[PDB]
Design a protein around this ligand. Structure first.
Ligand SMILES: CC(=O)N[C@@H]1[C@@H](O)[C@@H](O)[C@@H](CO)S[C@@H]1OP(=O)(O)OP(=O)(O)OC[C@H]1O[C@@H](n2ccc(=O)[nH]c2=O)[C@H](O)[C@@H]1O
Ligand SMILES: CC(=O)N[C@@H]1[C@@H](O)[C@@H](O)[C@@H](CO)S[C@@H]1O
Ligand SMILES: [Mn+2]
Lengths: 5, 495
């Protein structure tokens, strides 16, 4: 659920 | 103990491989077949700016202890993370790599890696979660500097020296690489943008923000200078070990996942340190869309509990803006926070208002007397100015969560406003378009009130409701209040 750079 | 190149990757990864006809995404929520094909030291592109590639990095730097926690990680990805650290770091700057096995189904995932030079493994005998697991690794650390990594990362060329340099100069800096993307489907390593900062909305969920055009322009002189960030992503950072201890480690009552990145960011800034992203440091990470593991009690409730513990200790009265965005969080019990409060007292930390004004000014904050704030949603559409100014109509557009023309407030004066323009009932005949006009407190045409459980907007002193049915043939209108879906509207924060 962490979103990418 | 065995040098990493002598480790038997084939044996280690073999026998947890995806069997024929099985789903390669089920166990990890990334493609394990593609992860398992890769060599433990596969080559990856150098994604650094040219300027980094030319620098010669200082030598006499303090060594670090690398802490990696994991719970049922894919063997290929865990091994690769460990070898990238060993292969891409000057050996004298790696004191040790501490692996914290957070109650994985199979203890051998961790224990077999214990053969490798510099690797130490610690096994939790019950599930503790990432916060307690990190603290246990930190406690075991022998070096002066701590480095945390997720268990599915790949360090790039000269990733470490730029980070250690910052903290050797000033131990109150907590620093992060640029986090490159390792694609969850094909495992290609992809260079991320260097123009990003960490942030969040009032729901307290981490998000990436672009730097402003002005911030970008002021860096044109040194494009690989450190970037101050309001918030770190959380899993990849470097911190002075004594500093980590003095500031109170992590909140040991947080469980599983979520919220600790927010808590430590607020604590570091408010209590006198800083958070940086360092463009010359690059580390890839497998970003995924779902958690592959369990959350005892449910993931929604754990995340909320952890986030409450952070908000209640650090955010002062601004915690109410989180409860306005996530009203269901008010019902989640969060336990005892006394030792965290006492920590804050003891450190003499600045108030949250100071953080908002000096660290994260670009976060839009409601006036303290606003009744409601944010976007005004109807299904997947949002109230939108369409770029119009005074005397112009208003419409709807797909919600995009990027603010600007979709940012509104319901004020203490009962006006629905964007900047200094207000929704104005210029004509009370049903079916009339409304218009944007300069806000005036004494103009009764601009007064609105929430009705039916904060699900509609009625013009005060009338039976007229805000209605979208004419949105594509003229703009929003006023219509007699009735059971129409085109009269449904909800603000994202209700105060
Ligand atoms: C990269 C980054 O930044 N990041 C960040 C982080 O760090 C955090 O901070 C979050 C918040 O909480 S976010 C983000 O997120 P993400 O990524 O999605 O998630 P992940 O991967 O799942 O991960 C996790 C880890 O731990 C561990 N874990 C978990 C759980 C438990 O229970 N235990 C453990 O150990 C695992 O294994 C791993 O390794
Ligand atoms: C011009 C137009 O079609 N309208 C859009 C606006 O209504 C906003 O959603 C903008 C984002 O702030 S973008 C774009 O200008
Ligand atoms: Mn991760």
């Amino acid at each position: 659920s962490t979103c990418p750079a | 103990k065995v040098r990493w190149p002598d480790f038997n990757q084939e044996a280690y990864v073999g026998g947890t491989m995806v069997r024929s006809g099985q789903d390669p995404y089920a166990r990890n929520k990334f493609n394990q077949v593609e992860s398992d094909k890769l060599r433990m030291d596969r080559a990856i592109p150098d994604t650094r700016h040219d300027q980094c590639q030319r620098k010669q990095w200082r030598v006499d730097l303090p060594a670090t202890s690398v802490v990696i926690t994991f719970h049922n990680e894919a063997r290929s990805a865990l091994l690769r993370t460990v070898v990238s650290v060993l292969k891409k770091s000057p050996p004298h700057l790696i004191k040790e790599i501490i692996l914290v096995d957070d109650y994985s189904n199979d203890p051998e995932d961790g224990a077999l890696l214990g053969k490798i030079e510099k690797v130490r493994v610690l096994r939790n005998d019950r599930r503790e979660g990432l916060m307690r697991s990190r603290v246990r690794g930190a406690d075991a650390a022998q070096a002066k500097v701590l480095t945390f990594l997720d268990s599915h990362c790949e360090c790039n060329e000269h990733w470490l020296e730029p980070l250690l340099e910052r903290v050797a100069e000033d131990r109150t800096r907590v620093v992060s690489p640029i986090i490159d993307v390792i694609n969850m489907d094909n495992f290609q390593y992809v260079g991320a943008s260097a123009d990003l900062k960490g942030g969040f909305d009032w729901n307290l969920v981490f998000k990436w923000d672009y730097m402003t055009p002005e911030q970008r322009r002021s860096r044109q002189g040194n494009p690989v200078a450190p970037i101050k960030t309001p918030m770190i992503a959380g899993g990849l950072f470097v911190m002075d070990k004594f500093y980590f201890e003095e500031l109170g480690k992590y909140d040991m009552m947080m469980d599983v996942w979520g919220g600790e990145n927010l808590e430590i960011s607020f604590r570091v800034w408010q209590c006198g340190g800083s958070l940086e992203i360092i463009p010359c440091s690059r580390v890839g990470h497998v970003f995924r869309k779902q958690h592959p593991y369990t959350f005892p009690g449910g993931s929604g409730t754990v995340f909320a509990r952890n986030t409450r513990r952070a908000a209640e200790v650090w955010m002062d009265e601004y915690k109410n803006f989180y409860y306005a965005a996530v009203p269901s969080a008010r019902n989640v019990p969060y336990g005892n926070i006394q030792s965290r409060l006492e920590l804050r007292k003891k450190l003499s930390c600045k108030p949250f208002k100071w953080y908002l004004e000096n660290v994260y000014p670009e976060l839009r904050v409601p006036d303290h007397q606003d009744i409601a704030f944010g976007a005004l949603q109807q299904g997947t559409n949002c109230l939108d100015t369409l770029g119009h100014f005074a005397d112009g109509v208003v419409g709807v557009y797909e919600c995009h969560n990027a603010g600007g023309n979709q940012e509104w407030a319901l004020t203490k004066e009962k006006s629905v406003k964007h900047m200094d323009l207000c929704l104005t009932v210029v004509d009370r005949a049903p079916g009339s378009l409304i218009k944007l006009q300069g806000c005036r407190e004494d103009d009764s045409r601009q007064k609105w009130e929430q009705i039916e459980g904060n699900s509609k907007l009625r013009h005060v002193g009338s039976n007229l409701c805000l209605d979208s049915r004419t949105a594509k043939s003229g703009g929003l209108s006023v219509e007699v209040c009735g059971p129409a879906l085109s009269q449904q509207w909800k603000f994202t924060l209700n105060l």
